[PDB]
Amino acid sequence: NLAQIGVVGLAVMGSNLARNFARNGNTVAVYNRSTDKTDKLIADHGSEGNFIPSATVEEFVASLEKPRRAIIMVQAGNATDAVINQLADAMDEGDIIIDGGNALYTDTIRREKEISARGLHFVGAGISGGEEGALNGPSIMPGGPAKSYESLGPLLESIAANVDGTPCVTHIGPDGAGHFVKMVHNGIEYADMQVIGEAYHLLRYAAGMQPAEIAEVFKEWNAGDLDSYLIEITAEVLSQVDAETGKPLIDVIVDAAGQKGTGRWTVKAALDLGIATTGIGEAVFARALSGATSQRAAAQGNLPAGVLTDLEALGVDKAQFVEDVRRALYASKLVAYAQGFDEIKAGSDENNWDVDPRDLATIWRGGCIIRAKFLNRIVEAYDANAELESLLLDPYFKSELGDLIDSWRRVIVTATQLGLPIPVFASSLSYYDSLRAERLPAALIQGQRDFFGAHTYKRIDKDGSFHTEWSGDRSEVEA
Amino acid sequence: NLAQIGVVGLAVMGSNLARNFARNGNTVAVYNRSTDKTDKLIADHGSEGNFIPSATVEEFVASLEKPRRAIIMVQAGNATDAVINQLADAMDEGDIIIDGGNALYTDTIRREKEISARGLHFVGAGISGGEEGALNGPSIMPGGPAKSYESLGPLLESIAANVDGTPCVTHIGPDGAGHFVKMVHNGIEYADMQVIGEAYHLLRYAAGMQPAEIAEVFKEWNAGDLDSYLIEITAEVLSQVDAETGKPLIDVIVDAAGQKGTGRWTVKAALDLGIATTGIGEAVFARALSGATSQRAAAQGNLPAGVLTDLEALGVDKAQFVEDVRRALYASKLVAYAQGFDEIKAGSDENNWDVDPRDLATIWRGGCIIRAKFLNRIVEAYDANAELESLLLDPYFKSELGDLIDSWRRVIVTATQLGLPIPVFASSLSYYDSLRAERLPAALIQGQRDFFGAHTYKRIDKDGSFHTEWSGDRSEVEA
Ligand SMILES: NC(=O)c1ccc[n+]([C@@H]2O[C@H](COP(=O)([O-])OP(=O)(O)OC[C@H]3O[C@@H](n4cnc5c(N)ncnc54)[C@H](OP(=O)(O)O)[C@@H]3O)[C@@H](O)[C@H]2O)c1
Ligand SMILES: NC(=O)c1ccc[n+]([C@@H]2O[C@H](COP(=O)([O-])OP(=O)(O)OC[C@H]3O[C@@H](n4cnc5c(N)ncnc54)[C@H](OP(=O)(O)O)[C@@H]3O)[C@@H](O)[C@H]2O)c1
Ligand SMILES: [Mg+2]
Ligand SMILES: [Mg+2]
Ligand SMILES: [Mg+2]
Ligand SMILES: [Mg+2]
Ligand SMILES: [Mg+2]
Ligand SMILES: [Mg+2]
């Protein structure tokens, strides 16, 4: 007569999640502040499994088997803190509050401190895949005490996406580690979509291909190493004809990316952690620029292009160019992921989480928009070398870069000569050529700062800080 | 027997600032929590002018002529709030608390609300030029109530940098406007230093010039449109020989800028405001990458370069290439400033500040690391069009871009073919080519997001939001 799991918040995400639990053989307690949403779920979806509805938090908590597991699925921020307090007040020692919402990981850290203190357990659970994932099988990223997973894990494994028998959930780490890895996942999604956008742009405006032909190229690419959900749905979007006009649907869509989106959080965290996420960063900046409606209108046809050429005048074969774009897309995808996994290691180190990157690449293979067989290469890279300094240095990926790099350079040159924007492709190659470099112009920056501000520099041949007496005899002294 | 201005916090920045006030004929109250610093200022510099040293906040406040003007120069964050509260409790209605520290503008906004509600005035003042500017003439960016500038303005004008008889201080706007434009100024400084670094890297590793020769090139550029303090000091740094090794000083400096600075705050604000600051962003990312010591050590000689060429094999004239790099530097500087001024506009609109960008380009000509005669072109651009959509569209600058664009494309092509990193040069050209684009891949992103999440899109040819039934008959409905 008791539920093993409960959901508070029965808007579409929490209702879909409750249904998932119930379809997979769990008894599920459900509560919503407004009872009409609870009544609607029972009325329209009660045949999907065993639900225990409650009108009050006290009734809801009383319906859960100890140790009690309540997932919150409400509005992020103040509304989730309100429900955490209501559950906290009603629960016993050893009970488990789970926020499944899209929390700021710093909110989850603060909540885990306040709730662990109250004698309760707090889990911040990132849930991927949006409404469809919540209903049919998400990737789940729980952070909190490791002993919370003993009672919660088997429940989450019952609803998670399954890939080759492996549920897309495992314990990520303490406190905010789950919401953190979910946030980085969101930023990676932006980069994956932007590198596809850039490939599309070159195939259309350099190779002269219409959307229906580009769809067919993407389906061919999707049979090879790039194989991915995002490339699969890209072909379906490029194939779609607008019934009203007969034009490709993409050609009647307003080309301004929804300014609603959390990819910016990923880049803010990378800026704080000292990680160069050029790929996610340029993908976010590209969405922002697309929305600058009045600036784009004022710019159109008014900035000098310079002398441009075209593939025919360059003597470039269309088939060779299309393959070069594929290889630029793969290289740029690989840089964006290497940077994202750098951000995961930096966040883990900063927060003492011991995040295992193999767990992330494993559970992102199902119920995620970014799912692709590429992720198995990330698992294998870290399996081979738990302390790998960059995904680019994995023996498999490094050997792949050997075959990509000539194409990648040709795409940057060619796009530039045709006046076509390629922000993540170009920025990824400058980042790559920066990691290759023996000496970077940061040495000059250190010298400039010592000149104007006496900020001091380190030396390659001696430990310590040094200063040149710029305003004086320009001798070097110790700082 | 009363001071017209006071300084709280007598570490080097505040001691320098107090000395500046005193050298310029003001009577200056000085106070530091630790009395030993007050004793030290009086002992070492009391001859420079009329100081009134106090050991306690109450004596300090009693030494000030009403309406009292106290400038706080202490550790940013909680320490600044601690000193604000101690002054506020000791002061009378109409008194003026000024924070001259490197405040987060959101902290200034909060402080101005709290302190104004108590019948005091709060000013957040950005002070540029570091320790040297505090002593010898800074750029000063005060935000707070306009009436505050009437008693404070003449004191700030007595110490500010002066350019052709114009003091580098004016009232910026309400509450946080001052600390906000200082934060953007800090980001711009990063971009100015990075574009100089990229030019240096190309002249050294593409044109085969040694640092002493590059120093002579920068001095010649400094005679033309690029004329700047940063280019002047760059030639002095590149001329410098390390006595101990005989190598160029730059060659014995550790090429790691790391994360010792606040340029990241500029990018985080840009991300929240929806502004594509690709120049400042890539500059900050480049500093972060330079500091990844273990990763760079692991990457050296392990990432495939691809087939590279050189200027000789390309048939490129060295003098033509050097001028092309100058013009890439100019174009990329202009893009970084255009984006920073877009960030200033977006911040001013979000916060109802009515920031006049002419004020900023006027007062950054003195006592700022970014000072350059280029800033006059920004004043003139906004003089001609208060609602200018981008600095790129100013008639003078658009005319300049007609002469820069062919060079700029050649530099991205050539750097790419030689395997040299140019993150701001290349990202600035993708941004430029993105403003030139009729249609951006943002249309494909809108289609993808509608496919996987039913996120809806807008149409170019009629009003409202639409959804294509991707899982069903792929008909379109209004949303
Ligand atoms: N659809 C998407 O694109 C997407 C993707 C991922 C996640 N999400 C989900 O979106 C939700 C965010 O909510 P929203 O603001 O957008 O929708 P909403 O309908 O305004 O709120 C959702 C739920 O929050 C509850 N709630 C709000 N304030 C509360 C309070 N103070 N005390 C108790 N319950 C409270 C509501 O209860 P009432 O019914 O009583 O109002 C409702 O059940 C999260 O659950 C998140 O998981 C969105
Ligand atoms: N190189 C630099 O450090 C540098 C460069 C840029 C800007 N600044 C400027 O210098 C200030 C920052 O100082 P810092 O943090 O770098 O150095 P710090 O040595 O940690 O402290 C700087 C000053 O803050 C005072 N202070 C700290 N906590 C305080 C508190 N709770 N109550 C009152 N006074 C307090 C100290 O007083 P005591 O002597 O009593 O400790 C000292 O006068 C700001 O005004 C900033 O704009 C410094
Ligand atoms: Mg039935
Ligand atoms: Mg299932
Ligand atoms: Mg292969
Ligand atoms: Mg580890
Ligand atoms: Mg002076
Ligand atoms: Mg000229």
Numbering used by the authors:
A (entry chain B), B (entry chain A): 6 to 484
Relevant lines from the article:
Structural differences between Cg6PGD_apo and Cg6PGD_NADP were detected in the residual movement together with the loop. A NADP-binding site was observed in the N-term domain. The N-term domain consists of seven β-strands surrounded by seven α-helices and was associated with NADP-binding. The NADP-binding site was constructed by Ala16, Met18, Asn37, Arg38, Ser39, Lys42, Val79, Gln80, Asn107 and Glu136. Among these residues, Arg38, Ser39 and Lys42 were crucial for binding to NADP. The guanidinium group of Arg38 established a stable π -cation interaction with the adenine ring of NADP, and the π-cation interaction and hydrogen bonds that formed between Arg38 and NADP played an important role in the stable cofactor binding of Cg6PGD. Asn107 interacts with 6PG and cooperates with Met18 to form a shallow cavity for NADP-binding. A structural comparison between the docking simulation of 6PG and Cg6PGD_NADP showed that the nicotinamide ring of NADP and the carboxylate group of 6PG are positioned in parallel, to achieve electron transfer. By checking our Cg6PGD_NADP-binding form, we found that Cg6PGD had class I that is typical of NAD(P)-binding proteins. The analysis of the structure of Cg6PGD_NADP made it appearent that Thr and His prevented the binding of NADP.
